Design a protein around this ligand. Structure first.
Ligand SMILES: Nc1ncnc2c1ncn2[C@@H]1O[C@H](COP(=O)(O)OP(=O)(O)OP(=O)(O)O)[C@@H](O)[C@H]1O
Ligand SMILES: [Ca+2]
Length: 360
């Protein structure tokens, strides 16, 4: 019997079997209720008649009722299995409140009656998925960005930094800067178009001010996007102005450090003796790190911050859109992991608080 691996995100949930190289179920973290109860794709298409809920905000579960439905759906509808037959790996955000980890443990055992379970930190699993057990992860998804220094599988809590600027913010940004040049977006279908344009045509410029000058003197960086009806929207500097907001959050009116300085600042919060290993093992994870050019820009920017003698290395796995899950698929498949689960037996004995001592 293979374990189940469930990665729940602010925008998308990913689910499948430990031992597999990819999740079998990927669907929106949406729960909709009439203006009886809908979840996922189903819920996105019936949105005209539904009040849509997002139970995970910035990576943290804020609604446990809606969250319980997502997990129900995941097991019975998307994966078509039974929880009491399968050990379950769940993932959690870095710095997840102690109460949230307890409530999560309680729900699996008591609502779904799992035989065994575990909860792992999303960023740690992306590191594992790349072949490493020490390094720093930049995890940027739909809702939140984290910089997570990890030492031999342990995320260093004092050094983790959180930035609420990620994919949904960049889609809203692109809408806005496309609006300023003429276009108009009043419907939810039009937002989904902008999000597709973002994912297909945006990129990170190696030198922003130079790329801006390029864009102003010719149409060499222009690309067109063709709509189903046959109309086309043409995009120039908005291609790289949108993800520039990751490095300059001012563009969104945020008084915050860019993803480069956040990464640096986490490294500097760590012990001087491990920094060498962090600098050469900076791993990108998450959908918002998928922009072409992002690794070379991170490399450039961190080189400019770190000591001149330091080796800077940014690892950007091609499949990093799913690396959290894949990391989990690996862990949960390992033979040596097998006695690290929390058993139904251990739960009954100790309660929900056993999670703090078994999943550290
Ligand atoms: N090719 C791409 N280029 C740029 N952005 C992308 C690309 N593919 C997906 N994204 C963005 O990635 C986000 C989803 O990534 P991911 O599933 O890692 O996030 P999540 O886990 O749902 O959310 P979070 O980690 O913030 O809780 C969406 O905002 C999406 O627009
Ligand atoms: Ca995520």
């Amino acid at each position: 019997v293979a374990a189940l691996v469930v990665d729940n995100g602010s925008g998308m949930c990913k689910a499948g079997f430990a031992g597999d190289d990819a999740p079998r179920a990927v669907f929106p973290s949406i729960v909709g209720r009439p203006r009886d109860s809908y979840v996922g794709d189903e819920a996105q298409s019936k949105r005209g008649i539904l009040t849509l809920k997002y139970p995970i905000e910035h990576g943290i579960v804020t609604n446990w009722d809606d969250m319980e439905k997502i997990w129900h759906h995941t097991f019975y509808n998307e994966l078509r299995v039974a929880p009491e037959e399968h050990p379950v790996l769940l993932t959690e955000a870095p710095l997840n409140p102690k109460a949230n980890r307890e409530k999560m443990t309680q729900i699996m055992f008591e609502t779904f009656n799992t035989p065994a379970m575990y909860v792992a930190i999303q960023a740690v699993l992306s590191l594992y998925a790349s072949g490493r057990t020490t390094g720093i992860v930049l995890d940027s998804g739909d809702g939140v960005s984290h910089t997570v220094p990890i030492y031999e599988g342990y995320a260093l809590p004092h050094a983790i930094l959180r930035l609420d600027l990620a994919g949904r913010d960049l889609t809203d940004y692109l809408m806005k800067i496309l609006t300023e040049r003429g276009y108009s977006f009043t419907t939810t279908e039009e937002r989904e178009i902008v999000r597709d344009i973002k994912e297909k045509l945006c990129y990170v410029a190696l030198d922003f001010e130079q790329e801006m000058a390029t864009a102003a003197s010719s149409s060499s960086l222009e690309k067109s996007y063709e709509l189903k009806d046959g109309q086309v929207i043409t995009i120039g500097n908005e291609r790289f102005r949108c993800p520039e907001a990751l490095f300059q959050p001012s563009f969104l009116g945020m008084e915050a450090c860019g993803i480069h300085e956040t990464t640096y600042n986490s490294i500097m919060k760590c012990d001087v003796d491990i920094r060498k290993d962090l600098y050469a093992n900076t791993v990108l994870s998450g959908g918002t790190t998928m922009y072409p050019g992002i690794a070379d820009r991170m490399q450039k920017e961190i080189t400019a911050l770190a000591p001149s003698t330091m080796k800077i290395k940014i690892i950007a796995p091609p499949e990093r859109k799913y690396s959290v899950w894949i990391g989990g698929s690996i862990l949960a498949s390992l033979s040596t992991f097998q006695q690290m689960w929390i058993s139904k037996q251990e739960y009954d004995e100790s309660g929900p608080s056993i999670v703090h001592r078994k999943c550290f």
